[PDB]
Amino acid sequence: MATFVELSTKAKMPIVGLGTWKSPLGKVKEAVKVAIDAGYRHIDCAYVYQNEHEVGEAIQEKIQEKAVKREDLFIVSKLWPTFFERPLVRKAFEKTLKDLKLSYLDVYLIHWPQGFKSGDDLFPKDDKGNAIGGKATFLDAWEAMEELVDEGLVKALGVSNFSHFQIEKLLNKPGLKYKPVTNQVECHPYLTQEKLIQYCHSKGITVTAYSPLGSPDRPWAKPEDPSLLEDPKIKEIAAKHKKTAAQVLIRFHIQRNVIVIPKSVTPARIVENIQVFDFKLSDEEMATILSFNRNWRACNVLQSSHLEDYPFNAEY
């Protein structure tokens, strides 16, 4: 059982959640089942992961067997950028809700600020693999998502992979009924997101950290790419508390009041990843970790720097 972070809607969002990116079918259902048993009350989902139907089976099992009540679960999913056109936001949202077997979501995020070519080709690209843009923007999608909140099919909306520039574009839209409650971005000691976090909090927006362990199993990894779990300075700090480097990397976010969503389908690691409320990193250990900032992204896979709202060019 965890601390939470309060949203501007006064809803309470569990500070540690289970990530499900790349969680295979046949493993993800058991993954969710172990996490809930382990005290995870927050599960992070997406249409684009193409496994929400199996996540929905697991959640439903545990509500059935009285292990957890819906009101105490905090379920998040994401709208993919080939569905920014208006009838498609509703259709994409309905498939997510149906696969998840839920009556409502706690938060619905814009997964990526750049519209891609509309439709169920989720990664439209040219011959060189560059993203094919669509004409609908994240503003068009937000307007459509706002309807879902009006209807009580979504408690709150948020953003993911937004720069402060694109949040400014959102917050400064005339006519906006709802603001985002969170901005979910990659964050870890190599990419500490200090300005963006300071920006989002100043605006009442929480931050959710994905890839907190450096997403080591990412298929596109180079052996030259730095590894956080094998980092001696991260390992020194883990040794001090007799915890794992992984436990240190998750706790780092908790002590910044940043929500963090480590992904696992391995039961022993799922449990390990939430045993982070019986120790504390010192201000000096925290400052050492923050010094490791390299401005290095493990996830920069969409070859899309050529379309309009690219988030990663900007300083923050």
Ligand X SMILES: NC(=O)c1ccc[n+]([C@@H]2O[C@H](COP(=O)([O-])OP(=O)(O)OC[C@H]3O[C@@H](n4cnc5c(N)ncnc54)[C@H](OP(=O)(O)O)[C@@H]3O)[C@@H](O)[C@H]2O)c1
Q: Which residues bind ligand X (CB under 6 A)?
A: 19-22, 44, 111, 160-161, 184, 210-217, 229, 244, 246, 261-266, 269, 272-273
Rounded distance, CA 22 to CA 12, Å? 27
Is 22 labeled as ligand-binding?
yes
- Token output for 76: 């998040």
Is 272 annotated in some ligand binding site? yes
CB 56 within 8 A of CB 90: no
Number of helices (H), then strands (E), belonging to the chain: the values are: 10, 9
Please indicate whether residue 310 is annotated as part of the active site. Answer: no
Position of minimal CB gap to ligand X: 19
The encoded tokens of residue 216 equal 């080591």
Cα 46 to Cα 33: distance, rounded to the nearest angstrom:
18
Structure tokens that stand for 191 in this block: 């990419």
- Report whether 251 belongs to an annotated binding site: no
15 labelled binding-site residue: no
8 Å CB contact between 207 and 185 = yes
What amino acid occupies position 29?
Answer: K
For 210, the enclosing helix (H) or strand (E) is: strand 206-210
Q: Cβ distance 207 to 196 under 8 Å?
A: yes
Shortest distance (Å) from residue 253 CB to ligand X: 11
The answer on whether 103 is annotated among ligand-binding residues is: no
| Residue nearer to ligand X on the CB measure, 216 or 226 | 216
**Using an 8 Å Cβ cutoff, are 186 and 298 in contact?**
yes
Compute the least distance from the CB of residue 46 to ligand X, in Å.
6
Of 110 and 148, the one with the shorter C-beta distance to ligand X is 110
CB 99 within 8 Å of CB 52: yes
Whichever of 96 and 177 has its CB closer to ligand X, that residue is 96
- Out of 40, 47, 49, 190, the active site residue is 49
Choice between 134 and 262, CB closer to ligand X? 262
Annotated binding site for NADP(+): 20-22, 44, 160-161, 184, 210-217, 261-273
Q: Among all residues, which ones are annotated catalytic?
A: 49
Annotated binding site: 20-22, 44, 111, 160-161, 184, 210-217, 261-273
Annotated binding site for substrate: 111
